[model samples]
Target: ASIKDWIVCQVNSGKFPGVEWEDEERTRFRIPVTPLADPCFEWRRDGELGVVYIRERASFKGTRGRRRMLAALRRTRGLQEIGKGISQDGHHFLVFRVR
Candidate 1:
């Protein structure tokens, strides 16, 4: 019924990556590295908003990877990013909502 519940439900249903057990609350998820773009993505839920953390392990050569991630996020039902940020490690962060 809530965002957290929905996320846990969907992920448990094999819709996305299984929750990483390291996070006690089970709010954290790690998407497997893909050969398509090679950007590692981590997902979490904060209140009603979902946060997507992108870890670009490779060189900052192009926006193709970022674009692809954003495109996928945009396609998600009821997903709308509230803001974006960058970590000290150059990881990209997106805080969004799906309502």
Candidate 2:
């Protein structure tokens, strides 16, 4: 759709002290949003959860790509991090948003 700005932050676990709400130290990076198109248009629906889709191509790339992505997320008017989790897929996962 359109490019968005977003700020990414990390959530501490038992090993690390968690960040306080509105804490500046928790912020990681600010980036922008980029959209990509895929001809396949893979799609699926999750009951009560929502719709899921897969894209063959991503709009962004490389370090610059990530920076843009994060910045876009931060642009939201009132996004905030309210939860955290560890991912078994490979890396740990956490939540963030614009507040």
Worst 10 residues of 2 by lDDT: 45-54
lDDT of 1 by residue, 1-99 (tens): 333444345445554442222244643433222223334434322111222223421322344444455466556665555555544544444555445
**How well does candidate 1 match the true structure in TM-score terms?**
0.32
Stretches of model 1 off by over 4 angstroms after superposition: 1-66
Scored by CA lDDT, what does every candidate get? 0.39, 0.29
Residue 12 C-alpha lDDT in model 2: 31
lDDT of 2 by residue, 1-99 (tens): 322121222223211122222346644321111112322211110010011011210432323333343454446555553545433332222356443
Model 2 misplaced stretches (Cα beyond 4 Å): 1-61, 97-99
Q: Which 10-residue span in candidate 1 carries the lowest summed lDDT?
A: 44-53
Error of 2 at 57 (Å): 15
Error of 2 at 59 (Å): 8.9
Q: Estimate the lDDT of model 2.
A: 0.29
Number of the predicted model whose TM-score against the real structure is largest: 1
